[PDB]
A paper describes a structure:
PpF1 has three FadL orthologs, of which TodX (Pput_2883) and CymD (Pput_2901) are located in the adjacent tod and cym/cmt operons respectively. Here we show, by using an integrated approach combining growth assays, X-ray crystallography and molecular dynamics (MD) simulations, that MAH uptake as the first step in biodegradation does occur via lateral diffusion. In the presence of TodX/CymD, robust growth is observed, providing the first direct evidence for MAH transport by FadL-type channels.
The lateral opening in TodX involves both β-strand S2 and S3, contrasting with EcFadL in which only strand S3 is involved. To flatten the S2 bulge, we removed seven residues that were not visible in the density of TodX, replaced a proline with alanine and inserted an alanine to connect the strands (ΔS2). The two TodX mutant channels ΔS2 and ΔS2S3 have much smaller lateral openings, while retaining overall high structural similarity to the wild-type protein. Plate growth assays with vapour-phase toluene showed background growth for the TodX and CymD lateral opening mutants, indicating that they are defective in toluene uptake. For TodX, background growth is already observed for the ΔS2 mutant, so the effect of the additional flattening of strand S3 in the ΔS2S3 variant cannot be assessed.
Numbering used by the authors: 4 to 400, 408 to 428
């Protein structure tokens, strides 16, 4: 979602972030970094663009071709008040997700009828940090940040009867409606969710949250820095909106019901990263961070409740223990006095599998490989660059094979106010 450091610049160097100037994006990173910022007041201005490519194939020529793009932004201004550095920003990750069309084997009944229903998802995060960085000694900086959050989810899932069957079997599905139209669907049917309503005026199924953050740094040597930060599991609230469940019979008939979803305990990971920035040269600077996503850490259940005039349906997915580890290294050579060149590789590696291959919910990529530079044309104006690579992956276990990749591409601009 954003466990990739973030920063037009912190993206260029493998996602590294913990101990070196990473731009104003250190507000959602390590706010202690903001103390390595030029004097006066930096004003960052970022524009993100991701595209994503998913191929799903199984039981012969299953042909699910998704290929969306998303687009984010960055409006930030970190201001220096002596040893204090105050700052705030707006950050966007809008359009992220999937779209398969209503032509897919994903849009065929469990018995195999081509439905007109769509398979697609799209999320919109809206972080808004208020942060500070505090210079303390000639060797140690500290920073915190707190952010209001706002998420918006539209999605068009379809579940071939047997999946629903498995969900009732597990004890995860329930509700008035399950008995009632079990026979209308019938083994060989399918139910289909559609929370659309992107008109936020409607319901949209959206929520407000609160993230947190704080970190530090140590100049162990004069040519070596020592970063650490703990992102808090962001307390997202309930996603309440308006959706439309639609059961589908063996021969292709459709009952459209209209109600309200309430998604509960969408667990976001707390994370703790550590690393360093050795500088054995006045061009060659190199960063290396390890990150540990404190993932599954509460013993709740994500609870999706659909309530209609005709009764409720309800799904409860437990919070399995889980966690990931992103080893990220990055590099920035100074070709000249106006030019830095960055590159980075990073390898995430999660444990305990959790291989619930959800086509409409893409999975985090392990190997990333990123490049990028910087260029000055004003010295009080400045402009950063990055591109990263989601490296080819296979994941598969109903039987389903999926193979997908991602490709981020950022820009930002800092007009400095001395």
């Amino acid at each position: 979602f954003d466990l990739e450091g973030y920063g037009a610049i912190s993206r260029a160097m493998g996602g590294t972030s913990s101990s070196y100037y990473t731009g104003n994006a250190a507000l959602i990173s390590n706010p202690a970094t903001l103390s390595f910022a030029p004097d006066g007041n930096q004003f960052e201005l970022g524009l993100d663009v991701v595209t994503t490519d998913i191929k799903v194939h199984d039981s012969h020529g299953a042909e699910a071709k998704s290929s969306t793009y998303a687009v984010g932004a960055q409006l930030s201004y970190v201001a220096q008040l002596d040893d204090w550095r105050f700052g705030a920003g707006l950050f966007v990750s809008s359009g992220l997700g999937t779209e398969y069309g209503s032509k897919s084997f994903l849009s065929q009944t469990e018995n195999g009828i081509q439905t007109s229903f769509d398979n697609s998802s799209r999320l919109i995060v809206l972080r808004a940090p208020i942060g500070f960085s505090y210079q303390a000694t000639s060797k140690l900086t500290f920073g915190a940040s707190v952010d209001l959050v706002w998420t918006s989810l539209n999605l068009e899932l379809l579940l071939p009867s047997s999946q629903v069957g498995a969900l009732t079997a597990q004890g995860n599905l329930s509700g008035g409606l399950v008995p009632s139209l079990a026979g209308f669907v019938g083994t060989g049917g399918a139910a289909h969710f559609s929370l659309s309503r992107n008109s936020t005026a409607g319901g949209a199924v959206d929520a407000v949250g609160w993230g947190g953050r704080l970190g530090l740094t140590y100049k162990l040597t004069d040519n070596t820095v020592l970063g650490a930060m703990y992102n808090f599991k962001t307390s997202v609230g309930d996603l309440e909106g308006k959706a439309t469940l639609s059961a589908i019979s063996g021969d292709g008939a459709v009952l459209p019901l209209d109600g309200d979803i309430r998604v509960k305990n969408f667990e976001m990971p707390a994370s703790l990263t550590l690393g360093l920035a050795h500088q054995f040269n006045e061009r060659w600077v190199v960063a290396a961070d390890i990150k540990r996503a404190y993932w599954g850490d509460v013993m709740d259940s994500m609870n999706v409740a659909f309530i209609s005039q005709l009764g409720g349906i309800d799904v409860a997915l437990p919070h399995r223990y889980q966690d990931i580890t992103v080893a990220s290294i990055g590099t920035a050579y100074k070709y000249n006095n106006d030019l830095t060149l960055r590159a980075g590789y990073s390898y995430a590696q999660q444990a305990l599998d959790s291989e619930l291959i959800l086509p409409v919910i893409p999975a985090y990529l392990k190997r990333h490989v990123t490049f990028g530079g910087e260029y000055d044309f004003d010295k009080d104006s400045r402009i950063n660059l990055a591109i990263s690579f989601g490296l080819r992956e296979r994941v598969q276990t109903e039987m389903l094979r999926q193979s997908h990749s991602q490709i981020n591409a950022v820009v930002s601009y800092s007009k400095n106010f001395h």
